Design a protein around this motif. Structure first.
Motif, PDB file in Angstrom:
ATOM      1  N   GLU A   8       9.067 -13.873 -58.575  1.00 59.09           N
ATOM      2  CA  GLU A   8      10.130 -15.252 -58.535  1.00 59.09           C
ATOM      3  C   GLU A   8      10.565 -15.151 -56.828  1.00 59.09           C
ATOM      4  OE1 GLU A   8      11.792 -16.479 -61.252  1.00 59.09           O
ATOM      5  OE2 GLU A   8      11.061 -14.907 -62.620  1.00 59.09           O
ATOM      6  N   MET A  11      13.384 -12.674 -56.284  1.00 63.11           N
ATOM      7  CA  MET A  11      13.427 -12.275 -57.480  1.00 63.11           C
ATOM      8  C   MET A  11      13.683 -10.198 -57.164  1.00 63.11           C
ATOM      9  SD  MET A  11      10.147 -11.589 -59.791  1.00 63.11           S
ATOM     10  CE  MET A  11      10.472 -11.484 -61.529  1.00 63.11           C
ATOM     11  N   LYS A 135      10.810   0.393 -69.994  1.00 62.23           N
ATOM     12  CA  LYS A 135      10.383  -0.260 -68.764  1.00 62.23           C
ATOM     13  C   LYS A 135      11.147  -0.438 -68.147  1.00 62.23           C
ATOM     14  CE  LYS A 135       7.306  -2.879 -71.884  1.00 62.23           C
ATOM     15  NZ  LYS A 135       6.782  -3.975 -72.764  1.00 62.23           N
ATOM     16  N   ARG A 137      10.341  -1.951 -63.220  1.00 62.13           N
ATOM     17  CA  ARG A 137       9.449  -3.038 -62.484  1.00 62.13           C
ATOM     18  C   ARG A 137       9.017  -2.467 -61.011  1.00 62.13           C
ATOM     19  NH1 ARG A 137      12.660  -8.161 -61.867  1.00 62.13           N
ATOM     20  NH2 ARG A 137      11.674  -8.770 -64.143  1.00 62.13           N
ATOM     21  N   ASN A 157       5.416  -5.237 -64.904  1.00 64.19           N
ATOM     22  CA  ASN A 157       6.717  -4.029 -65.846  1.00 64.19           C
ATOM     23  C   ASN A 157       6.290  -3.272 -66.464  1.00 64.19           C
ATOM     24  OD1 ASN A 157       9.108  -6.339 -64.859  1.00 64.19           O
ATOM     25  ND2 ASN A 157       8.524  -7.179 -67.056  1.00 64.19           N
ATOM     26  N   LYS A 205      17.508  -2.458 -64.949  1.00 68.23           N
ATOM     27  CA  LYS A 205      17.857  -3.336 -64.788  1.00 68.23           C
ATOM     28  C   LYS A 205      18.622  -2.585 -65.593  1.00 68.23           C
ATOM     29  CE  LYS A 205      20.564  -7.360 -65.312  1.00 68.23           C
ATOM     30  NZ  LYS A 205      20.171  -9.367 -64.834  1.00 68.23           N
ATOM     31  N   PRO A 207      22.024  -1.834 -68.117  1.00 65.04           N
ATOM     32  CA  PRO A 207      22.183  -2.944 -69.819  1.00 65.04           C
ATOM     33  C   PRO A 207      23.406  -2.782 -69.675  1.00 65.04           C
ATOM     34  CG  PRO A 207      21.278  -1.829 -70.670  1.00 65.04           C
ATOM     35  CD  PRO A 207      20.586  -0.997 -69.044  1.00 65.04           C
ATOM     36  N   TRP A 212      20.687  -4.152 -60.854  1.00 64.45           N
ATOM     37  CA  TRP A 212      19.367  -3.182 -60.731  1.00 64.45           C
ATOM     38  C   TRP A 212      19.285  -1.707 -59.923  1.00 64.45           C
ATOM     39  CZ3 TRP A 212      14.852  -5.233 -62.909  1.00 64.45           C
ATOM     40  CH2 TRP A 212      14.501  -6.331 -63.611  1.00 64.45           C
TER      41      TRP A 212
ATOM     42  N   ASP B  17      15.463 -14.099 -64.316  1.00 64.97           N
ATOM     43  CA  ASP B  17      14.262 -14.155 -64.128  1.00 64.97           C
ATOM     44  C   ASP B  17      13.705 -14.184 -64.999  1.00 64.97           C
ATOM     45  OD1 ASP B  17      12.919 -11.891 -64.281  1.00 64.97           O
ATOM     46  OD2 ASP B  17      14.355 -10.507 -62.948  1.00 64.97           O
ATOM     47  N   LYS B  18      12.370 -14.309 -65.039  1.00 61.76           N
ATOM     48  CA  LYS B  18      11.434 -14.717 -66.412  1.00 61.76           C
ATOM     49  C   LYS B  18      10.467 -13.510 -66.942  1.00 61.76           C
ATOM     50  CE  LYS B  18       9.238 -18.618 -63.663  1.00 61.76           C
ATOM     51  N   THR B  19      10.491 -12.567 -66.350  1.00 59.47           N
ATOM     52  CA  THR B  19      10.997 -11.473 -67.600  1.00 59.47           C
ATOM     53  C   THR B  19      11.100 -10.013 -67.716  1.00 59.47           C
ATOM     54  OG1 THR B  19      10.016 -10.081 -65.580  1.00 59.47           O
ATOM     55  CG2 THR B  19       8.390 -12.121 -66.623  1.00 59.47           C
ATOM     56  N   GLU B  20      12.541  -9.851 -66.896  1.00 61.06           N
ATOM     57  CA  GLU B  20      13.726  -9.366 -67.040  1.00 61.06           C
ATOM     58  C   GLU B  20      14.442  -8.947 -68.140  1.00 61.06           C
ATOM     59  OE1 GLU B  20      17.138 -11.580 -64.672  1.00 61.06           O
ATOM     60  OE2 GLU B  20      17.707  -9.952 -66.416  1.00 61.06           O
ATOM     61  N   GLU B  22      11.723  -8.861 -70.957  1.00 58.19           N
ATOM     62  CA  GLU B  22      10.617  -7.811 -71.402  1.00 58.19           C
ATOM     63  C   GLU B  22      11.779  -6.227 -70.518  1.00 58.19           C
ATOM     64  OE1 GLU B  22       7.332  -7.622 -69.759  1.00 58.19           O
ATOM     65  OE2 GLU B  22       5.707  -6.188 -70.375  1.00 58.19           O
ATOM     66  N   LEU B  23      12.148  -6.083 -69.863  1.00 59.24           N
ATOM     67  CA  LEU B  23      13.108  -4.895 -69.421  1.00 59.24           C
ATOM     68  C   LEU B  23      13.994  -4.610 -70.929  1.00 59.24           C
ATOM     69  CD1 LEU B  23      13.091  -4.722 -66.016  1.00 59.24           C
ATOM     70  CD2 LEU B  23      11.572  -4.250 -67.460  1.00 59.24           C
ATOM     71  N   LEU B  24      14.712  -5.703 -70.900  1.00 61.04           N
ATOM     72  CA  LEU B  24      16.089  -5.113 -71.551  1.00 61.04           C
ATOM     73  C   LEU B  24      15.054  -5.322 -73.042  1.00 61.04           C
ATOM     74  CD1 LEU B  24      19.541  -5.479 -72.347  1.00 61.04           C
ATOM     75  CD2 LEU B  24      19.227  -7.955 -72.503  1.00 61.04           C
TER      76      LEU B  24
END
Ligand SMILES: N=C(N)NCCC[C@H](NS(=O)(=O)Cc1ccccc1)C(=O)N1CCC[C@H]1C(=O)NCc1cc(Cl)ccc1CN
Ligand SMILES: CC(=O)N[C@@H]1[C@@H](O)[C@H](O)[C@@H](CO)O[C@H]1O
Ligand code: NA
Ligand code: NA
Lengths: 250, 28, 11
Positions: A8, A11, A135, A137, A157, A205, A207, A212, B17-20, B22-24
């Motif tokens: 994106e 991104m 995971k 990225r 990812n 990222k 939590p 990031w 974003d569209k896939t973050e 998945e990380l969380l």
């Protein structure tokens, strides 16, 4: 990046392209860690087996990019290098142990919607997030398959893998300065870095604080996206004392 | 940087974003 | 295959 998707816009605003001046071509990925410092893999700059030993004046960095090949007028910024610093114990002879380098820019880059630095991990964030199954990225403009090339930045990812599984996937000696990531054959899903993604970031990222962090640097792999192999990444936190020493000294 | 890791077009706008996610979801 | 970059960056 194999089996990824188009990024994106904005991104990965820390993404940096290492670019050769002559012939004009992509050399590697990299990441922006402040207005004057870029992080990459040592093998992007020094790899004697392939007759690679770049000097500052050989190279440019292009920051804020999305398209691989276009000149992204009014968006990307192109910077010259003041100095390269390679880890003094980088092992190019064997297994790319300590595959890390810093590049200081001649002038600071202006941040924008497309240009912004990533964080480097503290010990606690690294301890919390560097766990098997978690995971991160990976992003880059490298090849789409081992054996072609993307229009725009690619993103995938991938889960961190247990250290014994990483070790048992290869005959190469794995060190504490590396971790590996990728799916296992029985997991169905796929993805990896590939040629040209070298030096780009593996980010997570947090939590805890929403930010990031760059946990890894794209380092090496036996092929790209092969079943039973994994991608290997420089362990940024393990080498952070060196990073801090360089920035503090220079 | 005090502002590191907060993307202008995502975290600074409270946009995902569209896939973050998945990380969380992997941070168990 | 890359678009030429401004000459100012190559000088
Ligand atoms: N001839 C080429 N252009 N590529 C083929 C050799 C690829 C080599 N991997 S290996 O199987 O040879 C194991 C190895 C290892 C590190 C040093 C020496 C050997 C490798 O990987 N290396 C060698 C130095 C640079 C480095 C690299 O190409 N890194 C990018 C890369 C990163 C990841 Cl995370 C995943 C895949 C790939 C692409 N293979
Ligand atoms: C490992 C290796 O060959 N390093 C060389 C270094 O000895 C030399 O001084 C420099 C000159 O640009 O190029 C690089
Ligand atoms: Na092994
Ligand atoms: Na694999």
């Amino acid at each position: 990046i194999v089996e990824g998707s188009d990024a994106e816009i904005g991104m990965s605003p820390w993404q940096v392209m290492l670019f050769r001046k002559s012939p004009q071509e992509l050399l590697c990925g990299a990441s922006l860690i402040s207005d004057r410092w870029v992080l990459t893999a040592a093998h992007c700059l020094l790899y004697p087996p392939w007759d690679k030993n770049f000097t500052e004046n050989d190279l440019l960095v292009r920051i804020g990019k999305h398209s691989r090949t276009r000149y992204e007028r009014n968006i990307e910024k192109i910077s010259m290098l003041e100095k390269i610093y390679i880890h003094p114990r980088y092992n190019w002879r064997e297994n790319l142990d300590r595959d890390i380098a810093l590049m200081k820019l001649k002038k600071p880059v202006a941040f924008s919607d497309y240009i912004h630095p990533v964080c480097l991990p503290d010990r606690e964030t690294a301890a919390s997030l560097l766990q098997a199954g978690y995971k991160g990225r990976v992003t880059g403009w490298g090849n789409l398959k081992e054996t072609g090339q993307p229009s725009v930045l690619q993103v995938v990812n991938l889960p961190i893998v247990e250290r014994p599984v990483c070790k048992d996937s290869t005959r190469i000696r794995i060190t504490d300065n590396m971790f590996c990531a990728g799916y296992k054959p029985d997991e169905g899903k796929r993805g990896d870095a590939c040629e040209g993604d070298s030096g780009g970031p593996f980010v997570m990222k947090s939590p805890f604080n929403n930010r990031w962090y760059q946990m890894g640097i794209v380092s090496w792999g036996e092929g790209c996206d092969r079943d039973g192999k994994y991608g290997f990444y420089t362990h940024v936190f393990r080498l952070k004392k060196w990073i801090q020493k360089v920035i503090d000294q220079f | 940087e005090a502002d590191c890791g907060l993307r202008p077009l995502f975290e600074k706008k409270s946009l995902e974003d569209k896939t973050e996610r998945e990380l969380l979801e992997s941070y168990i | 295959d890359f678009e030429e970059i401004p000459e100012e960056y190559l000088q």
